[PDB]
TrEMBL record:
InterPro entries: SSO1120-like_N, Thioredoxin-like_fold, Thioredoxin-like_sf. This is Glutaredoxin related protein. It comes from Saccharolobus solfataricus (strain ATCC 35092 / DSM 1617 / JCM 11322 / P2). SUPFAM superfamilies: Thioredoxin-like. Residues 2-83 form the SSO1120-like N-terminal thioredoxin-like domain. Pfam families: Thioredoxin_17, Thioredoxin_3. Belongs to the glutaredoxin family. Disulfide bonds join C23-C44, C110-C113. PANTHER family: GLUTAREDOXIN-LIKE PROTEIN (PTHR37170:SF1), GLUTAREDOXIN-RELATED (PTHR37170).
Length: 165
């Protein structure tokens, strides 16, 4: 069960103002409500969760961040709520240069996906000019195919599908 880990990560950050907007993942997020503000959106055909602090949207995860995506997801909540980033100074400077849409496709059965999500969650913290969206490719199959995604993790920048040659 996820109750203990959710408490261990979120009980402290209770003093912050992290806000999660979600839909179709009620049974998971009902527990988060014990620690952070949770808004449940209406009329969703597929699940999603948006992470905000005030009016700022840090990212939207299309699917439900469970299995190996839960740890990075909880970590991002704590980092955002405490306004801390762990990327080194060079990565930070470099990350601040990016602009526009950044879409990361993942699936649960994916070893390198959590590593990439964690890295991008931190980039979304450092750079408000980036619009980060994460997609569970098994759930959002149309999006996966639109961007010609086969293996994951796969990052798409500025909605551009890069095709060799």
């Amino acid at each position: 069960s996820y109750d203990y880990v959710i408490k261990e990560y979120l009980n402290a950050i209770k003093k912050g103002d992290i806000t999660i907007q979600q839909c179709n993942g009620d049974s998971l997020f009902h527990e988060f409500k014990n620690y952070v503000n949770v808004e449940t959106l209406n009329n969703c055909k597929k699940p999603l969760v948006k992470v905000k602090r005030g009016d700022r949207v840090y990212y939207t995860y299309y699917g439900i961040p469970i299995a190996n995506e839960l740890w990075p997801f909880l970590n991002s909540l704590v980092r955002i709520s405490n306004n801390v980033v762990n990327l080194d100074e060079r990565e930070v400077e470099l990350a601040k240069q990016v602009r526009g849409s950044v879409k990361l496709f993942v699936t649960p059965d994916c070893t390198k996906c959590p590593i990439t999500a964690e890295f991008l969650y931190q980039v979304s913290q450092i750079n408000e000019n980036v619009k980060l969206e994460i997609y569970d490719a098994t759930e959002y199959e149309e999006e996966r195919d639109k961007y010609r995604v086969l293996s994951v993790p796969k990052i798409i920048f500025n909605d551009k599908v890069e095709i060799p040659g």
